[PDB]
Amino acid sequence: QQEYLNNNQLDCDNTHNSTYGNVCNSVTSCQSYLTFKSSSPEYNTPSSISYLLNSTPSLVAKSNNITDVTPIITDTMVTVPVTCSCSGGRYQHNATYNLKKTGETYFSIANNTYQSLTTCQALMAQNPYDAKNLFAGDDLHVPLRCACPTKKQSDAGFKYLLTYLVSQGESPDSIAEIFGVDTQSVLDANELDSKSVVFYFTPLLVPLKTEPPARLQIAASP
Ligand SMILES: CC(=O)N[C@@H]1[C@@H](O)[C@H](O[C@@H]2O[C@H](CO)[C@@H](O[C@@H]3O[C@H](CO)[C@@H](O[C@@H]4O[C@H](CO)[C@@H](O[C@@H]5O[C@H](CO)[C@@H](O[C@@H]6O[C@H](CO)[C@@H](O[C@@H]7O[C@H](CO)[C@@H](O[C@@H]8O[C@H](CO)[C@@H](O)[C@H](O)[C@H]8NC(C)=O)[C@H](O)[C@H]7NC(C)=O)[C@H](O)[C@H]6NC(C)=O)[C@H](O)[C@H]5NC(C)=O)[C@H](O)[C@H]4NC(C)=O)[C@H](O)[C@H]3NC(C)=O)[C@H](O)[C@H]2NC(C)=O)[C@@H](CO)O[C@H]1O
Numbered sequence: 001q002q003e004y005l006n007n008n009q010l011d012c013d014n015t016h017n018s019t020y021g022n023v024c025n026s027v028t029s030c031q032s033y034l035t036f037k038s039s040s041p042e043y044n045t046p047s048s049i050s051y052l053l054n055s056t057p058s059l060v061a062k063s064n065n066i067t068d069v070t071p072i073i074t075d076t077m078v079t080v081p082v083t084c085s086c087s088g089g090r091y092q093h094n095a096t097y098n099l100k101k102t103g104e105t106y107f108s109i110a111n112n113t114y115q116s117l118t119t120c121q122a123l124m125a126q127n128p129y130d131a132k133n134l135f136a137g138d139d140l141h142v143p144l145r146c147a148c149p150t151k152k153q154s155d156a157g158f159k160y161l162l163t164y165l166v167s168q169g170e171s172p173d174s175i176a177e178i179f180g181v182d183t184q185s186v187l188d189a190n191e192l193d194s195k196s197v198v199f200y201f202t203p204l205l206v207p208l209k210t211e212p213p214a215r216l217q218i219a220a221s222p
């Protein structure tokens, strides 16, 4: 289990513990998965998505049953295999981001560019620049959100945790159905209960018994 971000990432003066990253509470490194919605024209191939998220094109291709050069229609969700490791008491997967235009902010980078796979709080904690003093060309250390299964999760047969980007209209039930897991395990993974509200544009951990479905668009259809 990890705390649910609960929209605390949308206010960069908020200092809730969850915003600094999942907590290192199990094995210190593991295989994990992110998700990402194809964004045209900058982040819609295995090469560009892997560049942003520091995966590899072959890993993205294999995970989604495409080739390493197959373009991906805008707004399609793809799985992104990554290594998740402990650093400074947190689980994260490291990437690097060079700002493209002055006017980008820790918030726009975390929320828009990285689609809530990181938070402005973790970016600020792990980079030297003041929020009001960022410019094109600055290179940021990006701590992407991932975790490794706890002992309790592992004993239940969960081999991986996947960071899932929630879209408008989904629920813990509909997301669990995509992956063939029970809704209660999704709730447990995020320290939520059956009445908890889950927001769109906020990530949610999904425990997996096996590799995720290769094409999520069809898994997500009713
Ligand atoms: C039958 C049944 O039960 N069905 C169930 C379903 O109902 C259910 O589905 C769920 O249903 C829910 C209920 O409907 C629904 O909940 C709703 O969810 C909504 C979406 O989340 C939510 O809306 C949210 O609400 C939040 C909270 O209010 C809003 O958050 C605010 O957002 C603002 C942006 O829009 C934030 O602001 C920005 O803040 C940042 C700082 O953090 C700031 O950044 C700084 O900017 C300055 C410049 O301006 C920067 O400074 C500059 O820096 C540069 C670079 O250095 C310099 O060059 C420059 O000089 C310098 N300038 C200056 C002047 O200094 C600075 O650097 C930045 N700082 C940093 C660190 O980067 C920005 O400027 C701010 N922007 C603006 C525009 O002001 C604001 O902080 C934030 N507020 C808070 C408090 O966080 C969101 O906007 C809003 N989102 C939307 C889309 O509207 C609703 O409230 C929810 N409602 C309820 C009732 O809960 C669920 O989503 C829904 N789920 C799903 C999946 O559909 C399901 C599921 O449970 O179940 C069914 O069963």
Ligand SMILES: *[C@@H]1O[C@H](CO[C@@H]2O[C@@H](C)[C@@H](O)[C@@H](O)[C@@H]2O)[C@@H](O[C@@H]2O[C@H](CO)[C@@H](O[C@@H]3O[C@H](CO[C@H]4O[C@H](CO)[C@@H](O)[C@H](O)[C@@H]4O)[C@@H](O)[C@H](O[C@H]4O[C@H](CO)[C@@H](O)[C@H](O)[C@@H]4O)[C@@H]3O)[C@H](O)[C@H]2NC(C)=O)[C@H](O)[C@H]1NC(C)=O
Pocket: 001, 002, 003, 017, 023, 024, 025, 089
């Ligand atoms: C941010 O969150 C961190 C994670 O918190 C937990 O995880 C999430 C998912 C939720 O479930 C949340 O409710 C959990 O708390 C949090 O770090 C945690 O902080 C607590 C503080 O209470 C630590 O508890 C202390 O643990 C020791 C034993 O260590 C245990 O944990 C470590 C973690 O790996 C394991 O390695 C060990 O094997 C143990 O399992 C206890 O000795 C101690 O109890 C008290 O004992 C003395 C004597 O009474 C008191 O004087 C002390 O004050 C102690 O309170 C603590 O309870 C917990 O270990 C730690 N976990 C991890 C993984 O780091 C962190 O504090 C949060 N930060 C902020 C700023 O909120």
Ligand SMILES: *[C@@H]1O[C@H](CO)[C@@H](O[C@@H]2O[C@H](CO)[C@@H](O[C@@H]3O[C@H](CO)[C@@H](O)[C@H](O)[C@@H]3O)[C@H](O)[C@H]2NC(C)=O)[C@H](O)[C@H]1NC(C)=O
Pocket: 065, 214
């Ligand atoms: C990964 O993607 C490829 C390409 O999209 C999928 O290959 C397609 O799947 C079917 C099932 O194996 C192939 O076999 C044949 O399909 C036809 C469908 O009419 C059927 O007549 C045959 O009996 C046979 O099942 C199909 O040719 C193939 N299409 C292409 C263009 O290669 C593949 O299934 C995907 N794999 C996974 C694990 O998702």
Ligand SMILES: *[C@@H]1O[C@H](CO)[C@@H](O[C@@H]2O[C@H](CO)[C@@H](O)[C@H](O)[C@H]2NC(C)=O)[C@H](O)[C@H]1NC(C)=O
Pocket: 085, 086, 087, 088, 094, 126, 141
């Ligand atoms: C990811 O980046 C972090 C820094 O954000 C690196 O953290 C180091 O982790 C090792 C091993 O846990 C420690 O010895 C260092 O002291 C840590 N540094 C900090 C600043 O916390 C981490 O090495 C990076 N991981 C990978 C795999 O590249």
Ligand SMILES: *[C@@H]1O[C@H](CO)[C@@H](O[C@@H]2O[C@H](CO)[C@@H](O)[C@H](O)[C@H]2NC(C)=O)[C@H](O)[C@H]1NC(C)=O
Pocket: 010, 111, 112, 113, 115, 116, 201
């Ligand atoms: C956080 O990022 C999301 C995208 O990841 C933003 O959603 C976009 O909002 C703009 C409005 O400026 C729309 O044109 C886009 O269509 C939206 N994208 C999607 C995928 O729906 C969102 O505005 C950002 N900010 C907040 C506070 O959520």
